[PDB]
Amino acid sequence: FACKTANGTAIPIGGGSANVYVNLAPVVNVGQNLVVDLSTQIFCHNDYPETITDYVTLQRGSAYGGVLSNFSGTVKYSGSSYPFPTTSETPRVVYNSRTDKPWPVALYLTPVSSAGGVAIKAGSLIAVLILRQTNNYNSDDFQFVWNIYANNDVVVPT
């Protein structure tokens, strides 16, 4: 099992970490959502799908920087919604093909009432999403740590 990002980088068999940059709506009002859909950027596959089933969870989602201080949010994983930052490891998604399949994670972030001005700075760390992968064959239990960075400033009008 391993993962890659679109025109990006890879995390090899056995896990590891990578940095992922996201484009954000440059202006978001209180009451609106910034939707950060990682399913178009992070893809994973099963290396032995004929004999082994891989199981993949969102182990944890954490907020950093301007997202931690200026937004409230939720994360959607494979059709289910959760608080972000997360409070538990999600149920598992099965990976059963060598064909790259999206990791179905999206953040829905909305400004808190105190946000104003530049609420997320370009280039800054905004989140960490930890993917945990196991299987039905051996003791493999690996973390794929995705450090999420903003491409651009996000302004909350005042």
Add this chain to the structure above:
Amino acid sequence: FACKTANGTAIPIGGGSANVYVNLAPVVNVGQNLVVDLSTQIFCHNDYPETITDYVTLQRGSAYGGVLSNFSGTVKYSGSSYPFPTTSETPRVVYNSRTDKPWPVALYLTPVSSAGGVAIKAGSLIAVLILRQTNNYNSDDFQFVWNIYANNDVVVPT
């Protein structure tokens, strides 16, 4: 502060996520209302009511699946009606008792004019409702994310 569901589960202190399975009227004609009353399903309480006031909002209500596609509606929160899907956080409801009390949320949904046949599929996600809880004591600010599923098909007759 924590919450529970009818014959169900709990989301404990600090928030989290749960699934709520609801029985829906099996037949709703164009021109009739489908009512999804969560006040009979979701109940919450304040853990220190002698010294602390808990404040609870519907931060956001989102529609999915057949409700998103085939119905238009509003949401009623503690006696006032708002658009659904929602466009802003509601006013606060006070929780001031240790006894579990309803979360006073109901969806009032009516089929769109072109809807017919199976308009909501049994087992499908129909809504996500975010309960946001704060207090007048400390910095606690917690989300309770309710994933709402239909237990049965809803047919719009033709």
